[PDB]
Amino acid sequence: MDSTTIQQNKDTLSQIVVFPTGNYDKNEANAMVNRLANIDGKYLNALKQNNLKIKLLSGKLTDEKEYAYLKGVVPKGWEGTGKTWDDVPGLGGSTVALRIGFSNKGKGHDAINLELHETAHAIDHIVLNDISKSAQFKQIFAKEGRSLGNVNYLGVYPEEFFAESFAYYYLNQDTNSKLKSACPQTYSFLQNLAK
Numbered sequence: 486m487d488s489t490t491i492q493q494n495k496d497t498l499s500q501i502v503v504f505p506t507g508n509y510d511k512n513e514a515n516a517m518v519n520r521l522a523n524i525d526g527k528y529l530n531a532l533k534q535n536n537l538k539i540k541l542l543s544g545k546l547t548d549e550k551e552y553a554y555l556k557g558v559v560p561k562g563w564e565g566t567g568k569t570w571d572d573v574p575g576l577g578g579s580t581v582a583l584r585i586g587f588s589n590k591g592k593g594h595d596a597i598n599l600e601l602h603e604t605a606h607a608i609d610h611i612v613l614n615d616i617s618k619s620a621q622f623k624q625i626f627a628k629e630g631r632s633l634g635n636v637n638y639l640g641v642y643p644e645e646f647f648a649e650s651f652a653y654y655y656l657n658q659d660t661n662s663k664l665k666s667a668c669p670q671t672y673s674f675l676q677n678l679a680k
């Protein structure tokens with residue numbers, strides 16, 4: 486990622502990202518925007534075109550008014566864990582909401598990076614017309630969909646494998662190289678999508 490392109494994408498993200506009212510680590514919110522800025526500018530401009538907002542949160546997801554309906558709701562597969570959506574740090578699809586500070590793997594979620602994974606869902610659904618459900622991607626998923634691990638989740642849901650692969654592709658050079666090695670067809674597919 487070249488520095489001038491990053492700044493251009495951050496400028497675009499200034500028209501996408503919404504910062505919260507409450508108090509939060511401004512430097513960490515900025516770091517999240519910096520990581521999002523590695524996403525290909527064409528996707529970012531398309532999110533902006535669709536008026537998609539990336540809402541950064543200063544607290545729990547379910548303490549946001551528009552997600553309060555998820556209070557106490559147990560996510561699929563989380564039965565018996567004692568955890569609920571109140572414990573989920575982010576979501577992506579038709580909207581994007583992300584708790585500041587919870588980017589890294591293990592911060593209440595299993596993704597390599599929260600904001601890239603969830604924003605990938607929004608790009609998939611809003612920008613790319615659910616390409617993760619396409620026949621082309623389904624063929625790739627059938628072969629490579631377990632190769633980032635979490636086989637009972639990423640390996641089962643092509644939308645999740647897409648989002649995680651997208652996050653590997655764009656997080657940093659290390660994860661990008663790892664994806665190329667582990668999932669070469671997925672890597673080529675993403676490379677060509679951004680052409």
Ligand SMILES: [Zn+2]
Pocket residue numbers: 602603606644645648
């Ligand atoms: Zn996901």
